[PDB]
Ligand SMILES: C[C@@](O)(CCOP(=O)(O)OP(=O)(O)O)CC(=O)O
């Protein structure tokens with residue numbers, strides 16, 4: 001069997017950080033995100049019988065074994081669930097700008113989930129692809145559905161999955177991603193999550209998440225941008241508060257990250273609707289009603305230290321091609 | 322001329338931070354804190370109660386204070402007047418040697434000095450405990466500048482339970498505070514309103530509940546001269562406070578981009594083998610704590626960091642003192 005599927009990365013408005021079950025990637029808290037249309041992972045899966053072990057190609061090159069044992073531990077699940085014991089060649093490509101440091105894990109395991117199961121013949125519901133993608137990478141659950149997506153955290157493998165709050169066309173929001181020239185090579189998120197429990201502030205952050213989710217959920221449905229803007233900045237600061245207070249601390253911010261966060265908040269307070277959020281890295285995502293993207297991109301491009309500004313709009317669900 | 326006294330006091334650098342109040346008017350804090358007095362900075366204050374004064378007058382470095390500072394000092398003198406059962410108003414003359422434009426807060430030094438000088442001028446002989454309770458009500462961390470050396474503020478729940486004591490004299494441990502003064506720094510939001518916003522942070526209650534763990538670690542570290550335990554906790558405690566500041570509504574981002582550069586560098590220096598640790602107050606300057614043998618090396622590295630206007634060297638200071646000037 002053979003299939004090919006594409007998925008978008010997503011930007012979390014309410015952050016996933018910390019695991020209730022690290023293996024199954026059942027999160028301590030729920031999260032909400034928007035798919036990013038202009039960036040894509042395309043992955044083809046080819047099951048061939050009696051090939052010894054699994055094979056992984058990434059952007060044309062033989063993936064490193066860390067990458068391969070991730071995908072083949074993943075494909076083990078697609079086997080345990082299909083009965084079928086075939087190994088497979090995985091070929092994946094993405095169009096992510098060169099060294100901008102943009103996280104691919106979500107888009108990649110969303111695509112891997114859709115192509116692998118379709119290639120091995122199955123026909124999973126959207127809810128079930130997301131339960132599957134989740135086990136490859138937490139935030140991958142959220143790239144399976146489209147548009148604005150909520151991840152229902154749950155306490156079991158069956159209860160933890162994501163669903164579309166709203167389709168992409170429901171709210172014309174843009175993400176202007178400030179890529180920082182100077183960029184470091186940060187601790188990967190899987191370790192970061194594990195260290196969240198060393199933070200004295202993680203329990204309080206986690207317990208407060210339903211308050212934050214309800215405000216953002218309502219804001220997306222009602223298209224209430226100022227409520228969205230203040231909450232995503234607060235949620236992003238809460239996650240980084242936890243990161244910065246872990247042992248050892250995780251300081252993903254670069255000095256220019258600080259400049260951008262302060263500038264975005266000043267821009268919004270003086271009239272330009274905009275808001276910042278950061279993942280486990282120094283790039284700064286600026287969310288704005290798309291009618292303001294030009295202005296936001298202009299102001300971001302003038303900030304010393306900003307290498308370039310990517311422009312992404314609300315993207316759709318993972319799809320077979 | 323009903324009574325006259327002069328006192329000196331030092332500012333202090335908090336190893337475990339005061340942030341947030343249980344009672345904002347009395348400055349009873351939500352949690353306890355530990356600090357070190359800075360030998361080389363001093364506020365000298367003379368109080369002269371005058372028969373004929375209708376109101377207090379405050380002179381700072383030879384110039385009339387602005388009205389907000391007068392108001393603060395006059396409200397403090399009200400408490401002294403009430404405490405002593407005396408009504409006289411006072412001339413307050415104060416000087417300090419703080420570098421101008423450095424952004425180093427003098428309020429702790431100022432109200433410790435004023436607490437000693439004013440009560441002495443008015444005829445009282447207060448215990449150190451009572452001096453620190455009184456200083457506390459002018460500015461919280463001023464209660465930590467009344468005792469000497471390494472100091473712990475006991476938080477309490479009442480005005481009579483909130484005060485600071487010396488946990489070790491200065492000479493017990495040769496630590497240096499190398500203060501990186503950042504060239505660029507604007508008027509930061511005053512601490513008084515920052516304290517008040519602490520309650521809007523979802524993380525403040527957790528930070529507060531955890532303070533006794535941090536205080537017990539730093540207290541033991543000082544008594545045992547254990548720099549490594551001290552270093553990791555002051556950095557963690559500084560980040561805890563700024564975590565609450567940055568998650569308040571509205572957020573308080575005291576850090577400057579340069580703040581971050583220094584914080585990362587200091588961690589690298591320590592891990593590379595130079596024993597140092599950073600801590601920040603409600604502003605962008607970075608206090609770099611080290612065993613005094615390494616201060617020269619630390620200051621040299623701090624000095625060459627772009628955006629660092631200057632580095633101030635401070636050793637452990639003694640208690641607020643009466644003098645004859
Ligand atoms: C900071 C985040 O982006 C966390 C992403 O974490 P991951 O989903 O990439 O972690 P793993 O499950 O280990 O692959 C916040 C978010 O996207 O919600």
Ligand SMILES: C[C@@](O)(CCOP(=O)(O)OP(=O)(O)O)CC(=O)O
Nearest residue numbers: 335338339460461462512513602603
């Ligand atoms: C951040 C800090 O420096 C807090 C100083 O707070 P203040 O004592 O200056 O506040 P007021 O009581 O309003 O005068 C941390 C610390 O010194 O413990």
